[PDB]
Amino acid sequence: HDNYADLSDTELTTLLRRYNIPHGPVVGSTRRLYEKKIFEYETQRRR
């Protein structure tokens, strides 16, 4: 439901890679933590 929540696991993984952000397995249990990490980085580029 969150903008980043509509991204699929495969698309989320390629996004972290573009920003060179270390990550492990993506699962609904830790998917949210990953969505927040991309938001914090993308926020910087927006500022």
Side-chain angles (χ1 to χ4, degrees):
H1 350 37
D2 275 11
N3 245 344
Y4 298 82
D6 292 344
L7 306 176
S8 151
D9 273 19
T10 308
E11 302 209 356
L12 198 81
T13 301
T14 195
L15 285 167
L16 288 167
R17 236 193 221 189
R18 173 181 235 174
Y19 316 121
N20 309 155
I21 285 166
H23 52 277
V26 181
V27 53
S29 257
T30 64
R31 177 196 243 176
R32 176 184 220 172
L33 175 61
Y34 282 117
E35 294 183 9
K36 188 177 223 232
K37 287 213 169 108
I38 304 166
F39 186 96
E40 181 165 345
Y41 187 81
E42 297 280 286
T43 296
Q44 271 190 0
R45 320 241 281 179
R46 279 189 211 170
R47 259 185 249 167

